[PDB]
């Protein structure tokens, strides 16, 4: 696909000029964070009453009472497949959002694995709101949204493999 | 102005890996070239029976009988508004195309001033044929067209200011 490769290049932002510092609230109940943000939730040091944790790192952890952790172990590399994880994950995040359950999606740096989940969910939410959205409209929305989140976080979805898989799923596919 | 800055991210192709070496036919009657292509037409050494030349350089020239030269004085710098003259230039190129006059749009390197006219005219022609094209559709078409022409010419519309002005005019507006 030409438009997919074009968009992957449009979103090749080069090296991060800042690293994520703090969690970012993507929707009223979905948050994007790092291992540092996840650790703060687990210590009971968070200012948000998180009900769910979406762990996209290799290492599992125990959760205190009242917090449910969903473990999606992924490697931040160029061959990892996220095409079958993403449809289930965006549906899960949309269900937690609808249930008004504050959720933290995280991975070690809070950049690539969790960033891919964050991008997928934001794309999914927009398409749920406008299911008629054309392929060029989806293309431009992905572009604008990618740079909008990257502006807040400094580093976001740098992994070209994941970004391409997300472009294929939410821009190319109807 | 805010929307145009993303497409400008998309068309930052880096350094040219080749420079234009012959004219490029953009449409049935509109061609893009350099000073070298313009001088070949004027010597009667061209392979096309050109009826018009659109000179987008500061220096004017004389034309042989049967050839009409339109002079659009522009400099290739970061202090030029190419947008100011673009609506009348695309309107002129569309009229020459309709009159079926083979036309050569040129500037010294055949990259930036004539490249901006070439990009503007291709955008204009597409929108005239497809007037329902949406802003994202215009965005993607500009992007695809920019890389298509750059692939053929090596260097094309490298001047970021002209490229941004063209995005604003033909994609945003």
Coordinates of N, CA and C in Angstrom, one line a residue, chain A residues 2-3 6 9-10 134 136-137 139-140 143-144 147-148, chain B residues 2 6 9-10 12-14 136-137 139-140 143-144 147:
Chain A
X2 N 0.6 2.2 -1.0 CA 1.3 3.4 -1.1 C 1.0 4.4 -0.1
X3 N -0.3 4.7 0.2 CA -0.7 5.6 1.2 C -0.2 5.2 2.6
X6 N 3.5 6.1 2.7 CA 3.5 7.6 2.7 C 3.2 8.1 4.1
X9 N 6.0 7.5 6.6 CA 7.1 8.5 6.4 C 6.6 9.8 7.0
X10 N 5.3 10.3 6.7 CA 4.8 11.5 7.3 C 4.9 11.5 8.9
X134 N -13.7 8.8 5.5 CA -13.1 8.3 4.3 C -11.6 8.0 4.5
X136 N -8.8 9.1 2.9 CA -7.9 10.3 3.1 C -8.2 11.0 4.5
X137 N -9.5 11.0 4.9 CA -9.9 11.6 6.2 C -9.2 10.9 7.4
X139 N -6.5 9.1 7.1 CA -5.0 9.3 6.8 C -4.6 10.6 7.5
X140 N -5.3 11.7 7.3 CA -5.1 13.0 7.9 C -5.3 13.0 9.4
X143 N -2.4 11.3 11.1 CA -1.3 12.2 11.0 C -1.4 13.3 12.1
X144 N -2.5 14.0 12.2 CA -2.8 15.1 13.1 C -2.8 14.6 14.6
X147 N 0.9 13.6 15.8 CA 1.7 14.7 16.1 C 1.2 15.5 17.3
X148 N -0.1 15.4 17.5 CA -0.8 16.0 18.7 C -0.3 15.3 20.0
Chain B
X2 N -2.2 26.8 10.4 CA -1.9 25.7 11.3 C -1.9 24.3 10.6
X6 N 1.7 20.4 8.7 CA 1.8 18.9 8.7 C 2.2 18.4 7.3
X9 N 5.5 18.8 6.7 CA 6.4 17.8 7.3 C 6.6 16.6 6.2
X10 N 5.5 16.2 5.6 CA 5.3 15.1 4.6 C 6.2 15.3 3.3
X12 N 9.0 17.2 2.9 CA 10.4 17.5 3.2 C 11.2 16.2 2.9
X13 N 11.6 16.1 1.6 CA 12.2 15.0 1.0 C 13.7 14.9 1.2
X14 N 14.3 15.9 1.8 CA 15.7 15.9 2.1 C 16.5 16.4 0.8
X136 N -8.9 16.5 3.0 CA -7.9 15.4 3.1 C -7.6 14.8 1.7
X137 N -8.5 14.7 0.8 CA -8.3 14.2 -0.6 C -7.3 15.1 -1.3
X139 N -5.1 17.0 0.2 CA -3.8 16.8 1.0 C -3.0 15.6 0.4
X140 N -3.7 14.5 0.3 CA -3.1 13.2 -0.2 C -2.8 13.3 -1.7
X143 N 0.4 15.4 -1.9 CA 1.5 14.6 -1.4 C 2.0 13.6 -2.5
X144 N 1.0 12.8 -3.1 CA 1.3 11.8 -4.1 C 1.9 12.4 -5.4
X147 N 5.7 13.8 -4.8 CA 6.6 12.7 -4.9 C 6.8 12.1 -6.2

